Amino acid sequence: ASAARRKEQELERSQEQALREKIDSVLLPILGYGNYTAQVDIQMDFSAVEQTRKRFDPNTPATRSEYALEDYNVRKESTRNFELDTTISHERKQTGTVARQTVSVAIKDMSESEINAIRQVLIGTVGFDQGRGDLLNVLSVKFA
Amino acid sequence: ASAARRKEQELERSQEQALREKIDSVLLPILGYGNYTAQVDIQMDFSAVEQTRKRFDPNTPATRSEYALEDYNVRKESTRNFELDTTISHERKQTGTVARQTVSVAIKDMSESEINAIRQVLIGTVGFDQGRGDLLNVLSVKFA
Amino acid sequence: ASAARRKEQELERSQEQALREKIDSVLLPILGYGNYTAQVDIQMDFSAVEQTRKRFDPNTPATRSEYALEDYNVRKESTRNFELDTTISHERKQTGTVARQTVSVAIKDMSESEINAIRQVLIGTVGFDQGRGDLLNVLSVKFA
Amino acid sequence: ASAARRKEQELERSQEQALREKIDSVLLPILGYGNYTAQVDIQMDFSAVEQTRKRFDPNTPATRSEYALEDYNVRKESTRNFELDTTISHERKQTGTVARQTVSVAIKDMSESEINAIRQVLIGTVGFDQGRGDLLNVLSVKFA
Amino acid sequence: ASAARRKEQELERSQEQALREKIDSVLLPILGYGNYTAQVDIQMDFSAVEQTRKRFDPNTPATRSEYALEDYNVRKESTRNFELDTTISHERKQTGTVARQTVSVAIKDMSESEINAIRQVLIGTVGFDQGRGDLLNVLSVKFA
Amino acid sequence: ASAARRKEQELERSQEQALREKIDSVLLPILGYGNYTAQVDIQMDFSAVEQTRKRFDPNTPATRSEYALEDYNVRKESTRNFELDTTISHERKQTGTVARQTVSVAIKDMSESEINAIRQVLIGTVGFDQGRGDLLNVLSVKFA
């Protein structure tokens, strides 16, 4: 029960560790050893979702049987059968999708252009996405 | 029964410990050894939620059988059958989701800008989220 | 359960590693050792989708049986049967399709034409596709 | 489950390797050793599609039984049966079809005619096809 | 599953190898060693198609039974049976048909007539067919 | 499955080899050693076709039973039975029929009459047939 849950926790940590390497592999040759520091956080969910969809197309009907009666003298009778396009889809979702991620970078003292360029580099280095509400902050402060 | 519950408690502590490392890895090189102190708290729940949804689309009907009678002289009769889009979803929730989290940081004596910058760094260092009603306080006081 | 999921994670890393070789095999002879740095990221999904389609062609009907009555004096009666073209398709999707990919390249200090040419080379070196919302950034910054 | 999927990945790499030989066998004697560089990418899918078609020909009917009544005095009655041409087709698709392919070639420094001729040679050397949205770029840049 | 698929790949390579010999057996005695280079590509499919056709001839009917009534005074009645020509065909397609093929030939430096003659020779040497959208390019470029 | 298919490939090669001997047995004593070169290609199919035909002769009917009534006063009634000629044919097609064939011959340097005569000889030497869209080209070029 709770034995497996702890394992899940460890997995999250692993993800963070991976990120903590990648940012280390890019900022080190450009900024320098001891002139930067950063940390990351990854939050995920472990739900279990299944979906079954069964759709129809009402705009394309096909007739199979038809009966009509038009007895004037005004008796009018009609009986028709139809066949429709059916689509069935069955989907199972993954377990462990990343929900949110936060990255913070502090640089020892910079102009606006340099910070913007470093942020642009980190955009591809990390993979920031605005759809998931991700967070990425880069700034320069005085060390001590 | 109660043997497993205690384990859950330990898990919470582990989470706090993790945070107590991350804040230590960022504030130490910028502020300095012995010039800061902080503690965290994490509160979670261990419920068990299952959901089953079965939705329909009323705006897209598809006809299958149709019978009509229009006997004037004004007898009018109609009988129709319909087919609708059906969606079935089954979801199971996780056990151990984080509900609230509190972070407090005290700095030995600072200007407003420095405190704001440190708070901004901690925002990404911790992962503060306003949706869950999280709490983060950073301030400077005189030590003794 | 969770034992296999971790394996999936490793697979993603492998993909990134492959890319980290290819960019190394092209930029090295043109730019030079120690004058560039780059990192990549690949995000995928592990869903399980099955589809079953059953289509009809309403514009091409074929008659099988026909009965008519035209008793004037105005009794009119008709009864027809039809046969239609039926197409049945069953599809199963893959597991592990690439969703998004980000590439970032920084070059030590360049004119606009050189950067454009390097980007064009990397376009075929990596395989950037705008349909998936892929990201590729190449820029030049001052190293330290 | 995931053990076989990795194998699929390896297969893709093999394809690329093959291409990386063919371009090496053509450009080497014409351009020269150390005056060119190139890389390729191949993306495929591993779906499983089955199709069953059952077509009819409505323009060519054949009568089998016919009954008629033409009682004047105007009773008119008709009843006919028909036989139609039926075609049944069952198809199974392959697994591992190539979807897209990208080729990029850089030549150390050229006139437009020479680049056009090299592109024309590579057209048959690789097998570029516009139907699949393939990509082939050849250009000349200054090396370092 | 995937073990046999790889074998299919090898088969394709074999085809190319065969072509790479035939062009070598014709161009070598006429052009000379070291004055030409060429490569080929063959793309095939591995589907599985089955067909069943059941055709009729409506223009040639044969009567079997006939009943008529011609009671004047105007009662007219007729009932006829027919026999028709039936043809049944069952076909199974091959696996591994060649879809497209590309040939590219470069000759070290030529007049238009010589290139046209070499192309004409290669037409029969390879078997170029316009129905399948085959590609054959022969040109002369300056070597280095 | 695929083991036998490869064998089929080998068979095709054998056919070509046979042709490569026959042209060698005719052109050698008339043209001379080292004054000619040629190659052939044979493309076949490996389908499986079965046919069943069931034909009738409507122009030759034979009466078996006949009933007539001619009650004047104008009641007219007739009922006849017929017997027809039936032909049943069952056919099974071969596997490995030759579809197309290409022959190309180059002669070291000729007048039009000599080339026409050599083409006429090769017509019977090979067996060129225009029904299958066969290809045969004979020409003279300068060797090197």
Numbering used by the authors:
A (entry chain 2), B (entry chain 1), C (entry chain 3), D (entry chain 4), E (entry chain 5), F (entry chain 6): 255 to 327, 367 to 402, 418 to 452
How do the authors describe this structure?
The C-ring is tightly attached to the MS-ring, which consists of ~34 FliF molecules with two transmembrane helices. FliF contains three ring-building motifs (RBM1, RBM2, and RBM3) and β-collar in the periplasmic region between the two transmembrane helices. Among these motifs, RBM3–β-collar forms an S-ring on the distal side of the cytoplasm within the MS-ring. We performed single-particle cryo-EM of the purified MS-ring formed by FliFG fusion proteins with the FliG-G214S mutation and determined the near-atomic resolution structure of the Vibrio S-ring.
A total of 228,461 particle images extracted from 5,962 cryo-EM micrographs were analyzed. They were separated into two classes in the 2D class averages, with them showing either 35- or 34-fold rotational symmetry on the S-ring. Because the MS-ring in the native flagellar motor is thought to comprise 34 FliF subunits, it is inferred that the 34-fold rotational symmetry structure reflects the native S-ring structure, whereas the 35-fold rotational symmetry structure is an artificial structure induced by the overexpression of FliFG fusion proteins alone. Consequently, we built the atomic model of the S-ring part (RBM3–β-collar) at 3.23 and 3.33 Å resolutions from the maps of both classes after C35 and C34 rotational symmetry corrections, respectively. The monomeric structures in the S-ring part from the 35- and 34-mer structures are almost identical (RMSD = 0.286 Å). Our S-ring structures are composed of 34 or 35 molecules of the FliFG fusion protein. Their diameters differ: the outer and inner diameters are about 26.0 nm and 9.6 nm, respectively, in the 35-mer ring, and about 25.2 nm and 9.4 nm, respectively, in the 34-mer ring. In our two S-ring structures, the 34-mer structure should reflect the native S-ring structure, since the in situ MS-ring is a 34-mer of FliF. We compared the Vibrio S-ring FliF 34-mer structure with three previously reported Salmonella S-ring FliF 34-mer structures where a notable difference is the tilt angle of the RBM3 domain. When measuring the α1 helix angle from the side-view of the ring, the RBM3 outer part is tilted downwards by 8° in the Vibrio S-ring, whereas it is tilted upwards by 6° or 8° or is nearly horizontal in the Salmonella S-ring. When comparing the β2/β5 sheet angles, they all exhibited a similar angle (55°) when viewed from the outside of the ring, whereas the angle is smallest in the Vibrio S-ring (58°) compared with the Salmonella S-ring (64°–68°) when viewed from the side. When focusing on the subunit interface of the RBM3 during ring formation, interaction was facilitated by two sites: an electrostatic interaction between E270 and K276 and a hydrophobic interaction between A399, V429, and L447 in the Vibrio S-ring.
